[PDB]
Amino acid sequence: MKYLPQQDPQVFAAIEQERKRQHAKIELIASENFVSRAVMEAQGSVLTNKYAEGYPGRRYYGGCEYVDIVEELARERAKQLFGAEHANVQPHSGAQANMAVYFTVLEHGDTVLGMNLSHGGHLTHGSPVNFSGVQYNFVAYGVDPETHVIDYDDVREKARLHRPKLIVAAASAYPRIIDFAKFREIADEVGAYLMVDMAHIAGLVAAGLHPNPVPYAHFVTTTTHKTLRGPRGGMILCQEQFAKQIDKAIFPGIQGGPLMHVIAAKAVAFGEALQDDFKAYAKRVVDNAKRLASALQNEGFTLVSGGTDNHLLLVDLRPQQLTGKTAEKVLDEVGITVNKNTIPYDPESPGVTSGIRIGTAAVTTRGFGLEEMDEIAAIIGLVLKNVGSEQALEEARQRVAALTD
Amino acid sequence: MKYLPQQDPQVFAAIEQERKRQHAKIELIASENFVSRAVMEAQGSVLTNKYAEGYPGRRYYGGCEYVDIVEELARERAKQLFGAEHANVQPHSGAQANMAVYFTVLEHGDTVLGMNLSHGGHLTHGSPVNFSGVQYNFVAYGVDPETHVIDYDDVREKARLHRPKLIVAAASAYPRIIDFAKFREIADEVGAYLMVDMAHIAGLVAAGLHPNPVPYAHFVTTTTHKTLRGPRGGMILCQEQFAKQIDKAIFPGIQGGPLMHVIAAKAVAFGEALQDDFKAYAKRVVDNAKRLASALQNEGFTLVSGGTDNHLLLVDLRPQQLTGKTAEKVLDEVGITVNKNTIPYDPESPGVTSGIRIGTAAVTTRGFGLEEMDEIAAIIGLVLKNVGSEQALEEARQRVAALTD
Numbered sequence: 001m002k003y004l005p006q007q008d009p010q011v012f013a014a015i016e017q018e019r020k021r022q023h024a025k026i027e028l029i030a031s032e033n034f035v036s037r038a039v040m041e042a043q044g045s046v047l048t049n050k051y052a053e054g055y056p057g058r059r060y061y062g063g064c065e066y067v068d069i070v071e072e073l074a075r076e077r078a079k080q081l082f083g084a085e086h087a088n089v090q091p092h093s094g095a096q097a098n099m100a101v102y103f104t105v106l107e108h109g110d111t112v113l114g115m116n117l118s119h120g121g122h123l124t125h126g127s128p129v130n131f132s133g134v135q136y137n138f139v140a141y142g143v144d145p146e147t148h149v150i151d152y153d154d155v156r157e158k159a160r161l162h163r164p165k166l167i168v169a170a171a172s173a174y175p176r177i178i179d180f181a182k183f184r185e186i187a188d189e190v191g192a193y194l195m196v197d198m199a200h201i202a203g204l205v206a207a208g209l210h211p212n213p214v215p216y217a218h219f220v221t222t223t224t225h226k227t228l229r230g231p232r233g234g235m236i237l238c239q240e241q242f243a244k245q246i247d248k249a250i251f252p253g254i255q256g257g258p259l260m261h262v263i264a265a266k267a268v269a270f271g272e273a274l275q276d277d278f279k280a281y282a283k284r285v286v287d288n289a290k291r292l293a294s295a296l297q298n299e300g301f302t303l304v305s306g307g308t309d310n311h312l313l314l315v316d317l318r319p320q321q322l323t324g325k326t327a328e329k330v331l332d333e334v335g336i337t338v339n340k341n342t343i344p345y346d347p348e349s350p351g352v353t354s355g356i357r358i359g360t361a362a363v364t365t366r367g368f369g370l371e372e373m374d375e376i377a378a379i380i381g382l383v384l385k386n387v388g389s390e391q392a393l394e395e396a397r398q399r400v401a402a403l404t405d
Numbered sequence: 406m407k408y409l410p411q412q413d414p415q416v417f418a419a420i421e422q423e424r425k426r427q428h429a430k431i432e433l434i435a436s437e438n439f440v441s442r443a444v445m446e447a448q449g450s451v452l453t454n455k456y457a458e459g460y461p462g463r464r465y466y467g468g469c470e471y472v473d474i475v476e477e478l479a480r481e482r483a484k485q486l487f488g489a490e491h492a493n494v495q496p497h498s499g500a501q502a503n504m505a506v507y508f509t510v511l512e513h514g515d516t517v518l519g520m521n522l523s524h525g526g527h528l529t530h531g532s533p534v535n536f537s538g539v540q541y542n543f544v545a546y547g548v549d550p551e552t553h554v555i556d557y558d559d560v561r562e563k564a565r566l567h568r569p570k571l572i573v574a575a576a577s578a579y580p581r582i583i584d585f586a587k588f589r590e591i592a593d594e595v596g597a598y599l600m601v602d603m604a605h606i607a608g609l610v611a612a613g614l615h616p617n618p619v620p621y622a623h624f625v626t627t628t629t630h631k632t633l634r635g636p637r638g639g640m641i642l643c644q645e646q647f648a649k650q651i652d653k654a655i656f657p658g659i660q661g662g663p664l665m666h667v668i669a670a671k672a673v674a675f676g677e678a679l680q681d682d683f684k685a686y687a688k689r690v691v692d693n694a695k696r697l698a699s700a701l702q703n704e705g706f707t708l709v710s711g712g713t714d715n716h717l718l719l720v721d722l723r724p725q726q727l728t729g730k731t732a733e734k735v736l737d738e739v740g741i742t743v744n745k746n747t748i749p750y751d752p753e754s755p756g757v758t759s760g761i762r763i764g765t766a767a768v769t770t771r772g773f774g775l776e777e778m779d780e781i782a783a784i785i786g787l788v789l790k791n792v793g794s795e796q797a798l799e800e801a802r803q804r805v806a807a808l809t810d
């Protein structure tokens with residue numbers, strides 16, 4: 001950076017502080033990743049200066065000759081990546097992506113079937129404090145109390161009983177494979193649309209390491225910044241018969257000017273995902289998750305569903321006699337950055353929580369392998385089984401520093 | 406750029422063409438500006454990797470120590486810049502800034518009073534093809550058919566008649582000063598809340614060249630990328646009594662994770678606006694627009710409202726038999742970039758329009774003075790009056806290149 005240190009030392013210092021922290025700490029937040037320097041150069045470009053309301057060739061402004069190309073690259077690479085008939089790459093967020101689809105098929109107060117928050121579901125899947133629970137009538141399905149797996153019989157029962165207009169499958173903290181065909185089977189039985197939110201597993205779907213929801217869903221929504229390893233933003237994938245409707249929902253429906261620089265960055269992110277070395281990368285994330293889960297089990301931690309089938313695992317911290325709020329803070333002190341996370345049937349509210357959610361997507365990107373996962377789990381063990389010990393706390397800091405070196 | 410040209414040639418070529426076009430063409434899109442290289446460096450930072458749901462000190466993730474500083478800086482500066490009691494810098498957009506406020510003070514179907522689209526109002530101020538007009542019952546106020554100035558008597562009438570829960574003031578294509586005193590006076594008469602959308606005029610307000618809405622409004626929504634000359638995104642300013650409810654409306658209400666990198670650039674922009682430089686700049690913006698307006702009138706163009714008190718002007722193109730769509734396309738040919746824009750009482754639809762909107766915020770940033778505005782108005786006069794003339798289009802191209810170097 002050249003001009004920022006000069007004009008704004010306060011902001012620059014804060015950024016450099018953060019830039020060092022991302023290298024000095026061990027980022028284990030499941031939804032987080034480290035983007036390429038090409039992705040950052042794209043959003044750090046002049047495309048922020050451009051108003052491009054509308055779509056390629058159909059704009060409400062002049063001078064869009066070149067941002068139209070950037071957006072077409074994004075749309076076509078997306079369709080190539082997931083096999084979808086249509087793509088919308090303008091959503092500013094996953095939330096805005098989800099919001100748009102809801103705005104497309106649902107009237108105010110319509111019945112929607114979504115995964116319960118504490119069981120794994122996202123805020124936009126029907127949380128009472130989110131716009132989804134407020135705007136639409138959400139009924140919640142969930143997981144088994146013992147196996148912690150989606151009860152599709154429960155789902156069918158709810159669908160037959162409540163007769164929803166749309167069913168939403170997918171989750172923010174479900175360590176297992178979701179069967180989209182069963183969800184579609186249930187949706188056709190009750191005459192409902194199917195939405196799948198692949199935000200967390202989007203990079204795994206592109207790499208063939210999680211079954212594709214696209215052939216089974218009318219609408220597929222995603223973020224671009226999780227396992228897809230792109231810029232902070234959203235995306236919608238749909239069948240040709242919903243293309244125009246979805247596009248109008250984004251604009252003039254729920255958004256205004258699109259972020260063309262972030263859209264440019266999306267195109268790079270998708271270009272990177274199309275390459276072979278991303279499949280190799282994605283395999284390492286899944287392998288690093290399976291190992292870390294098993295390594296945490298060896299330390300004597302308990303995990304929901306007994307492990308993982310994808311990128312993330314969910315530690316139940318009840319036997320360790322700790323809340324997620326403590327675990328997060330104490331691990332953050334020594335170098336391990338996680339997030340407090342709600343477990344199925346969690347006795348605590350989503351601000352306190354009875355567990356922590358760990359992801360391997362970020363650490364894999366910076367070159368950590370199987371041998372490294374073993375040390376991560378041992379540090380987490382040393383810290384969480386010896387809470388108040390300043391000796392264990394300090395040893396952990398030396399060991400984390402040895403990893404990030 | 407160092408890594409994008411090698412990684413993604415197709416995306417890099419498009420960005421460079423766009424970069425060249427920004428310099429080569431005369432960008433007169435009223436809602437566009439050119440950010441500093443410092444603002445660009447901030448958006449391209451590693452802050453894009455951080456999930457920071459919640460607020461400084463109240464985060465649902467770990468490792469936020471530094472992004473918190475970035476957000477605090479953005480907020481405290483915004484308060485210093487506008488004299489607001491509270492600020493929210495997380496809105497992805499001006500669209501989302503407005504949406505959250507509507508989500509705070511309004512329930513579904515509620516009556517809201519906002520400015521008509523063609524009379525100058527924005528899409529989010531009650532369009533029936535926008536969520537605002539679909540979620541809420543919007544009654545429209547407009548401007549006088551002869552003077553094109555807000556009929557405040559009509560606003561007062563519409564307010565007494567429909568008893569709205571909220572009044573929205575401010576516009577996308579209103580070339581005159583909006584009396585906020587009168588709006589609050591009206592809002593207090595019917596007991597309604599007042600929201601002002603200063604998005605377009607934020608930079609002028611920061612410089613004491615437009616009456617500040619903050620003292621008169623309960624809520625002040627804005628974009629950061631217009632006359633404020635910052636990154637693409639939104640912001641909410643409000644009185645202290647709504648502070649907590651506003652923060653909840655953004656998250657977990659209508660948005661997910663904030664764009665921390667954009668919030669860094671938001672902090673940089675407000676810092677640029679706090680300097681003595683900015684006030685001088687903003688003066689030239691208003692002076693250049695006033696000159697360009699007068700110069701266009703000498704050429705024979707009919708201007709909505711007869712001139713401009715701000716950064717913006719609307720050309721009524723009906724006398725010269727041209728739609729806005731046509732005028733936008735022909736000026737693009739000669740190297741002048743505007744957008745087609747609806748005028749008060751437009752006989753045509755928003756996709757065709759009877760006029761064009763012109764702003765000076767962007768050309769003033771690159772150093773154009775009062776003498777450049779004279780030339781620009783001459784070129785626009787040469788082209789739009791000699792539409793088919795191929796020798797008139799070529800002379801324009803040469804005069805545009807003489808200005809842009």
Ligand SMILES: Nc1nc2c(c(=O)[nH]1)N(C=O)[C@@H](CNc1ccc(C(=O)N[C@@H](CCC(=O)O)C(=O)O)cc1)CN2
Binds near residue numbers: 342351458
């Ligand atoms: N299962 C699951 N885990 C997740 C998410 C999620 O949406 N679902 N998240 C993705 O967002 C992150 C956490 N974000 C969250 C933010 C707010 C609330 C929430 O319900 N807040 C309420 C209740 C507060 C309390 O009682 O503690 C509120 O603020 O009123 C939940 C999750 C990470 N883990």
Ligand SMILES: Nc1nc2c(c(=O)[nH]1)N(C=O)[C@@H](CNc1ccc(C(=O)N[C@@H](CCC(=O)O)C(=O)O)cc1)CN2
Binds near residue numbers: 060524526529756
């Ligand atoms: N006064 C004003 N000027 C403005 C805006 C605005 O919101 N208000 N804009 C805000 O950024 C841009 C225009 N954006 C717009 C986009 C769509 C529609 C609209 O009503 N579209 C309808 C019908 C259009 C058609 O097909 O002819 C539709 O899409 O169904 C209007 C304005 C530029 N100038």
